[PDB]
A and B are shown apart, each in its own frame.
With several copies, the nearest count.
Chain A
Amino acid sequence: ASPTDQQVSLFRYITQAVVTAPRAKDPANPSWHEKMLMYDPIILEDLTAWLNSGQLDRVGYDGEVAPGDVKKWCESKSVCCLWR
């Protein structure tokens, strides 16, 4: 594989895990996708924990993603992110 191709494939897994999660029933408890849609600043270690607790394995990716790799993902999607 290519180092920028291992990324483009990883990033589609994070995307699919994020956009296919159920939408909120309580509007005060938005999903990670809806938090991005409303420009909620994303706390990196929280989304990283979420992706690494079944959501990646759900969308067919066996492997733990790194917090800074989730940060790369947010920057590439214009998604506001920050460390904790």
Chain B
Amino acid sequence: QCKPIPALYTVYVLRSTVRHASLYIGSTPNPPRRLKQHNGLVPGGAARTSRSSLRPWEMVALVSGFPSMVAALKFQWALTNPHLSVHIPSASRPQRPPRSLASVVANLHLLLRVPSFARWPLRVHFFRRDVFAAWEKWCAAASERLRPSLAVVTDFEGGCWGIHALPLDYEPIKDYVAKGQEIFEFERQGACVVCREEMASGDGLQALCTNQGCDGVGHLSCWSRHFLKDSILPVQGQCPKCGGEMEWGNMMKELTLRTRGQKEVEKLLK
């Protein structure tokens, strides 16, 4: 595929600030811009949110870290259509609002555990106290816990916040990317930290340790066999060189950015 892993892509839970019982599920790489579309300040809002008496809307929660627009668009469909989403791996093939906030939370809790989405490098954000409360209430009643890998974060107002504190670009990894460009432009990649084989410039996919100040590089297929030391998609892992913990999602963001988004990198480094 021609594109790198997107900076930000989200599936969000929109709610009316006027009737809390009115909800809506969507996806966007630009949460602030899309919220303005729902509130009528920018053309392009959905039909359900068009209603004057329901504006303004708010984004009370969202899942981010989807590694493609397709991945987000599929999670968004399964969350909008819980009665049609079959979570057993299957050979298969306006918006009606959700029933309640409690059903969105239960189905979101379900979706983050089903095999289709269990290993995606995702993260849940909660921006309102009462929505986060219903989430914790369901999590405590449930027996099957969530991945420790799956970070669930909050950002309540008080003490730029919410979707307006989410970075819409590649700035959060800009240091990591800078480390990457200089390691490979000057051919300082050495040997694979796993198989101990020399890695000539341009010889397959060479992934870079995400911890700052460490220059450990390895063949992509070696890095994954190391994290998984059955299963295909790695999640969390430790660098054999620096000993630091790594998320497999961040390591792929940089690799695809270095390999398929060269123009995106030069713009980041300015």
Q: Does chain A touch chain B in the assembled complex, meaning CB atoms less than 8 Å apart?
A: yes
Which A residues have a C-beta under 8 Å from some C-beta of B?
11-12, 15, 18-19, 23-28, 30-31, 33-41, 66-69, 71-80, 82-83
Interface string of B95-133 (1 = CB under 8 A from A): 000000000000000000001111111000000000000
Which B residues have a C-beta under 8 Å from some C-beta of A?
1, 5, 67-68, 70-71, 74, 89-93, 115-121, 202-206, 219-221, 224, 230-234, 248-249, 252, 255-256, 259-260
Contacts of B1 in A (CB 8 A): 35, 40-41
**B-side binding surface: helix, strand, loop or mixed?**
loop
A28-B259, A68-B91 known; A78+B232 contact, CB < 8 A: yes
Q: Are A36 and B232 in contact (CB under 8 A)?
A: yes
Q: A36-B233, A68-B93, A76-B89 are in contact. List 15 more A-B contacts (CB 8 A).
A: A23-B205, A31-B221, A38-B220, A41-B68, A71-B89, A71-B90, A72-B90, A74-B116, A75-B90, A75-B116, A77-B231, A77-B233, A80-B67, A80-B74, A83-B93
Q: Name the 6 nearest CB pairs between A and B, nearest first.
A: A68-B91, A39-B67, A78-B119, A75-B89, A72-B89, A76-B89
Pick 11 A–B contacts, CB within 8 A, sort by A.
A25-B203, A28-B259, A37-B248, A38-B5, A38-B205, A41-B1, A41-B71, A68-B93, A71-B89, A75-B89, A78-B119
Q: What's the Cα separation between A33 and B232 when bound, in Å? A: 8
A71-B90, A75-B89, A76-B115 known; A23+B221 contact, CB < 8 A: yes
